[PDB]
Every structure is written in C-alpha cells, then in structure tokens.
Amino acid sequence: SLKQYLVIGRPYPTKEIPNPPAVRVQVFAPDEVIAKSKFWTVAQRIARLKKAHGEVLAVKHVIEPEPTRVKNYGVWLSYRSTRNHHNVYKEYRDTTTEGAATKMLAELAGTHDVSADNISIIKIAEVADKDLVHKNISQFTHENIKFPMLKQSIRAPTASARKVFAATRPTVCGF
RNA sequence: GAAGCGGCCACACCCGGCUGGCAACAUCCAGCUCCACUCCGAACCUGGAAAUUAAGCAGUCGCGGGCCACAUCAGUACUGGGCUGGGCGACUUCCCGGGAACGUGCGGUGCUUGCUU
C-alpha cells in the first residue's frame, strides 16, 4: 500500500556553482524505489531538474506520530479528463494521510473514472472540526451518532468452517 | 603611434557627430616624353611640391540599425524506446531516454603575425 515519503534532491556541482539549491517533494508510493521515480517526475516537470544530472539525497519515510486515533483530511487535487482539467477540494476521515490518499484514488476511479496517471495532488493536510466544511463528514464529528448495521454478512467465521447447505434460513436483517 | 605585407574574415559592416597630423599615408599641384582616354590628364600613367587635416585614414561618442556573446524562453515544441494504457475515431495520458527555435533581458563593438623609421 502507499506510504508517505519526503524526497530531497539536487543537481550536481558545476564549477560555476558548487552547493546549489536542493528541492523536496512529498510523494505517495508503495516503496522507496517508486518514490524516487515520482520525485524525478515532479522535479523535471516543474523545477527543471533531470535524472541524468542530479543527486537524490534522502528518501525519508514519514510514519505517523499516532495512528491510534481518527483525523479529518482535506485533499486539494487536480484531475484531468479528456478535453478539460478540473480542480476539486475533497476531504476524508481516516487514521493517516496515506489511507486518505488511498481512499481518493479509489473514489476518483469510482465516481469520475480517472486513473492515478491523470491525477495530480496539490495539498494534503489534517484539518480541525471548526474549519471543516462538508456535510457528510461533519456528521461523524458530532456526538450521539447511531447508525444500524442493516444488511449483515454471511461469511465463514473461519475459512475452515464454510458450508454450502443449511437447515435453518439465515437472517440478514440489521438486527 | 604610422607604413608596406598579411591571418581569422562584420566584436571588423552601414548612417551620423567630435578630436588629432613630427615623420608616414593622403588629399592636392602640373602635363613634356613612357602610355591614357570607343570624347575628356576625371580615371590610368608620369613629374611635383605650394598649403591644409575639410575628406579618406586613425582614435572616440550614440537609451543608433545590424553583427557577436551569455542567461532566460523551456523541461515548453518536437522526438527514440514500452504498455491486453485511454479513445467510435481523430489523436493522446503515463513509464525509461534525448531536447530545440523565435522572442525578451542584459553586455560587448576588433584581437596581433613577420620587416621598417
């Protein structure tokens, strides 16, 4: 699964300019090798720094201070569809920044039908309950939340104990 | 510094100003022979040296035209590989590589080969 990464890179020393500016990029990738390639894509596209003349100094893996508790996450992104580019601010409720970013790649591929090639994120950050403005996620920050589990599952409690017959009929009611 | 002989052949060209002539280059003065104008000593040619730096030439100036140089322009345009990627199609995301031009910004405007007073 995706892991947040911070990558810092720089161009090689020329004799004209030793110690140039380095540059960092936040990237989301399954491992350290992919995170380099996402850095070289963003560095080339914007800051004009190529693979063929540049170091890459530190792939830092961002682990969470606490994954124990739930946070809100605003995600400002652009996504591209044929004939136009759209800017969207979408937000999510999750244990971590990565799990929010993994959610929206599924949600955009679901709802809008665009892949991670076309998508380009601007900003992820955690956000307080006061500044949060979207109604369907604001309801989970309130107190006294009840919802029932209408439609129970029929699965095996362990994969040994599955069966394709039954005497009694299963009840799939919420209760 | 000036002159003959040249090398790379505009950072040297083209328009217009200003400052210099000790010798040197030149304008300039004259026309008899050499010879010269399909007419003309204007040119070419020959013999001068009175007076000038006005012109050529030399140096220098211009928010000058052009030329040259670096940086931006731009990781743009285009492009070599790869996908049972997308798309009715036309075309085009993405992955591994290469990478312009015009324009604009600031700078510059000849550097010296061998012989001679």
Automatic annotation (TrEMBL):
InterPro entries: Ribosomal_eL20, Ribosomal_eL20_dom, Ribosomal_eL20_eukaryotes. Keywords: Ribonucleoprotein, Ribosomal protein. The keyword Calcium does not apply. Residues 2-125 form the Large ribosomal subunit protein eL20 domain. SUPFAM superfamilies: RplX-like (SSF160374). It comes from the Eukaryota. GO terms for molecular function: structural constituent of ribosome. GO terms for cellular component: cytosolic large ribosomal subunit. Belongs to the eukaryotic ribosomal protein eL20 family. HAMAP family: Ribosomal_eL20. This is 60S ribosomal protein L18a. It comes from Trichomonas vaginalis (strain ATCC PRA-98 / G3). The lineage of its organism: Eukaryota, Metamonada, Parabasalia, Trichomonadida, Trichomonadidae.
